[PDB]
Ligand binder design. Structure first.
Ligand SMILES: [Ca+2]
Ligand SMILES: [Cl-]
Ligand SMILES: [Cl-]
Ligand SMILES: [Cl-]
Length: 223
């Protein structure tokens, strides 16, 4: 996250770190047994790490649970990142508490201008590299579809939205991928892609979760 702020420990209790020897993506807990992330975060041998703040220090509220199964969206296209969403089932259920909590799925899509919370342990520099040990947060609005499409002509589908600031300075970045965009208490986005980080007229691009709610519920219920 670039241009953000330190969230505070466990202030984002649905935020998960996906670990394969090292943090490589975020994700969101949606019930005690299931996490939603980006399809482009797919890897074998994922360990989900819940209740994290400093991902390099055991601070005492963590739960580390191996994934038992990953399900990538049937229509995921790795070339375009269309349908950039995947579900991850935990081998044992998470123990839910104030620091490890699920986030509601949307019942409808959010409108342009709605303020959202984006979070992750990704890079905090716009033109350099520096990775934080603690969770970073950014408040950012959903952008108009016309602004999003103008920024990325030929690349935005109905399953994507932009959020952030056209002036630049504030955005998600590498290592935030797969993590949450929460608006009015609902998981509306997944950190998906963009052009650089915090560049002018290049806001972050997010998977539009509200299009996937039927698929998520049917998939979880069947697996
Ligand atoms: Ca920790
Ligand atoms: Cl359309
Ligand atoms: Cl990434
Ligand atoms: Cl379930």
């Amino acid at each position: 996250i670039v241009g953000g702020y330190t969230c505070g420990a466990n202030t984002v209790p649905y935020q998960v770190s996906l670990n394969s020897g090292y943090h490589f993506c975020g994700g969101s807990l949606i019930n005690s047994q299931w996490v939603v992330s980006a399809a482009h975060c797919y890897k074998s041998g994922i360990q989900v790490r819940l209740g994290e703040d400093n991902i390099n220090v055991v601070e005492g509220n963590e739960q580390f649970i191996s994934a038992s199964k990953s399900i990538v969206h049937p229509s995921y296209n790795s070339n375009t990142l269309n349908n950039d969403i995947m579900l991850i089932k935990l081998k044992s259920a998470a123990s839910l508490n104030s620091r490890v909590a699920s986030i509601s799925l949307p019942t409808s899509c959010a409108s342009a201008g709605t303020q959202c919370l984006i979070s992750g342990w990704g890079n905090t520099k716009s033109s350099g590299t520096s990775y934080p040990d603690v969770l970073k947060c950014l408040k950012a609005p959903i952008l108009s579809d016309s602004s999003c499409k103008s920024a990325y002509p030929g690349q935005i589908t109905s399953n994507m939205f932009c959020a952030g600031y056209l002036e630049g300075g504030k955005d998600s970045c590498q290592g935030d991928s797969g993590g949450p965009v929460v608006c009015s208490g609902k998981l509306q986005g997944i950190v998906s892609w963009g052009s650089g980080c915090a560049q002018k007229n290049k806001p972050g691009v997010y998977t539009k979760v509200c299009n996937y709610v039927s698929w998520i519920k049917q998939t979880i219920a069947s697996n």
